[PDB]
Amino acid sequence: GASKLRAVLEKLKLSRDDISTAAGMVKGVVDHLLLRLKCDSAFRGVGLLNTGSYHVKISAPNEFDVMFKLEVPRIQLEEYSNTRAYYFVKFKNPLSQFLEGEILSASKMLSKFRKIIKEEINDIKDTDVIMKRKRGGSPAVTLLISEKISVDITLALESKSSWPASTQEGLRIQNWLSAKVRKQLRLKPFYLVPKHAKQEETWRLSFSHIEKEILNNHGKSKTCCENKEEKCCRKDCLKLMKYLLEQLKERFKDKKHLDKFSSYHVKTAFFHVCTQNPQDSQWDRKDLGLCFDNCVTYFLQCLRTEKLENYFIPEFNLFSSNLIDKRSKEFLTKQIEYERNNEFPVFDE
Ligand SMILES: O=C(O)c1cc(-c2ccccc2O)nc2c(Cl)cccc12
Ligand SMILES: [Zn+2]
Numbered sequence: 409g410a411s412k413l414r415a416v417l418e419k420l421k422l423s424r425d426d427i428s429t430a431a432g433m434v435k436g437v438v439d440h441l442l443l444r445l446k447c448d449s450a451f452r453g454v455g456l457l458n459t460g461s462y463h464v465k466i467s468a469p470n471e472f473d474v475m476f477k478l479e480v481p482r483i484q485l486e487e488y489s490n491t492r493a494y495y496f497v498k499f500k501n502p503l504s505q506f507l508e509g510e511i512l513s514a515s516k517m518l519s520k521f522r523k524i525i526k527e528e529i530n531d532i533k534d535t536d537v538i539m540k541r542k543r544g545g546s547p548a549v550t551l552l553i554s555e556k557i558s559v560d561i562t563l564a565l566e567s568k569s570s571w572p573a574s575t576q577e578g579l580r581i582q583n584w585l586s587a588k589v590r591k592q593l594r595l596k597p598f599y600l601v602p603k604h605a606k607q608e609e610t611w612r613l614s615f616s617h618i619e620k621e622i623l624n625n626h627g628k629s630k631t632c633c634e635n636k637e638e639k640c641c642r643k644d645c646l647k648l649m650k651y652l653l654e655q656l657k658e659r660f661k662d663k664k665h666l667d668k669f670s671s672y673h674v675k676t677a678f679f680h681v682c683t684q685n686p687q688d689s690q691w692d693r694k695d696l697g698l699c700f701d702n703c704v705t706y707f708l709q710c711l712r713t714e715k716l717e718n719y720f721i722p723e724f725n726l727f728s729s730n731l732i733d734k735r736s737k738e739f740l741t742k743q744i745e746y747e748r749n750n751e752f753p754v755f756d757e
Contacts, residue, residue, distance in 0.1 A: 409751055410697035416755050417644055420651065427470055431462040434472050434559045437537060437551065438463070441561070444528045445476070449502045450520065453479045457564060457599065459616045464559075467671050469654065471558040473547070475616065477599060480565045485572055492574035492723045494610040497565065497600060514602035514609045518548055521563050525549050546601045546612070564599040564614055571598050572613065578720040579618070584628060584686035593618055606730065615720045619675065627688050640691035642682065645703050649674045652704070655754045656743055665739050668732045676726060677707045679719045704748050711741040 438456065445451040456463040457475040465473035484498040497512035506517045522541070529537045529551065542550050547560030571594055581590050596618065603612035626632060626642050633639055650671045657666045681703050685691065691699050710716040710727060714737055718724040727737060747754055 410694075412751070412755055413644075413648060413696055413700055415757075416648060416651065420647060423469075427466060428462070430470055430557045431464040431466070431472060433553060434464050434474070434557065435462065437535065437553065438474050438559070438561070440532070440535070441525060441528055442476070445521075445524060448520075448524060450505060450517070451476075451478060451524070452502060455479075457566075457617055459620055465616070465620075467650075468558075470556070471560075473560045473562070475562045475564050475599070475601075475614075477564050477566045480567065483565070483567045483569060483600075485567075485569075487572070487574070488605060488608065488610050491605055492721050493613050493718065494603065494605045494608075495572070495600065495613070496609065497611055508609065511609060512611075514545070514604075514611055518545060518563065518602045522549060525551075525561070544603065546603050548602065562601055562614075564601045565611065566597050566599055568597045570594075574721045574723065575613070578718070578722050580683050580719075580722075581622065584683055585622065585625075593621065613721065618720070619679075622679070626682070628686060629688050632688050638688060639693040640688050641693045641696045641699050642691050644693075644696060645681075645691075645699050646675065646678045648700055649678055649703050649707070652744070652747070652752070652754065656740070656747075659754065660739075660743070665736060666743075668736055669740060673716055673726055674707065676716055676719050677710055678703055680717070681706045701748065704744065708741060708744055708748070711737050711744065 442454065442456060445454045454476050455478075457477040459465045459475050460473065463474060465475075467473050480497075480503060482500050484500055485495045486498065488494040488496060497514075498510050499512075503512060503517070506513050506520075508516070526539060529539050536554050537551050539549055539551050542560070546562050548563050549561045551559045551561065553559065575594075579590055579593065581593075599614040599617070600611035601614050602610075604610055623643065623646070627638070627640060629638055631638055653666075653669060653671065653674050657669070660666050684706070685702060714727050714729070714734070715725050716727040718726060
């Protein structure tokens with residue numbers, strides 16, 4: 409049981425250099441775009457947000473996520489219709505061209521963003537890239553690099569203001585990472601990505617920079633995982649949870665039953681389990697089997713109760729029916745429940 413999970417992690421390490429070399433060209437292309445974008449007055453202050461293990465984030469087997477941040481001077485937010493996560497953007501400048509009255513148009517800003525990138529990909533066709541526009545608005549643009557590697561590029565407005573009121577009861581890390589750290593983290597900027605709600609000129613809050621920071625400095629002890637005496641299995645548990653969902657989606661690709669589920673749901677439930685299990689002694693590497701069952705069991709509870717709170721916006725249920733069919737949640741409950749009750753045969757060789 410424990411050795412089966414260690415074998416999965418060892419197998420996942422086998423592609424460590426196939427995803428390290430892929431991201432090395434993603435970073436090549438992305439820095440190419442970052443300059444062209446800086447020639448435009450609206451995106452002059454654009455920069456790469458630190459969101460991944462490489463600016464380059466990996467959320468799939470071999471497909472990448474990159475965010476472009478844009479320092480937007482003092483912003484005023486108006487919450488869209490009690491959604492707690494979707495907002496209109498206003499001011500109190502080079503983004504003047506994108507207003508529709510007092511509101512910043514996301515679709516307008518997004519469109520010029522695309523026009524700039526589709527020209528850069530096509531003009532220097534001397535680099536083998538094309539782009540397929542996905543449906544979310546986030547991701548803004550998807551680039552296929554040599555018909556194998558995929559990179560999602562997200563535009564995001566940076567606000568150095570205090571976090572909006574919907575987050576004031578979120579980031580419940582006080583018993584785990586401390587109140588000192590929670591105060592430090594909430595003095596950092598927050599981001600807004602163009603996302604329509606289910607359509608409008610709305611923006612959605614994003615804290616992927618905070619997520620990376622609490623994954624890479626994840627212990628109650630400041631020296632967690634910096635020496636042989638303090639090796640926890642937090643990151644391994646999150647890896648196995650992502651891989652469990654990835655493998656299940658493959659198995660049920662015949663009907664795409666599980667297509668509404670995302671590694672973000674798995675990552676969100678894993679942060680709630682860290683809150684629930686705050687001591688590094690609850691994540692001792694030798695207890696991997698038990699720590700993974702703790703993660704799986706909480707995710708099942710979320711599926712069965714149809715409630716997975718956003719870690720930063722607790723009134724935003726990622727598992728609400730507005731977002732995910734009741735039939736799909738019940739489906740995945742049954743499949744994860746089977747996997748757990750039988751020592752995860754999806755991990756068999
Ligand atoms: O960038 C982020 O922090 C981020 C936020 C959210 C989110 C935020 C508010 C309400 C609902 C959401 O689903 N979803 C994400 C997904 Cl699904 C994938 C990757 C990143 C994110
Ligand atoms: Zn650790």
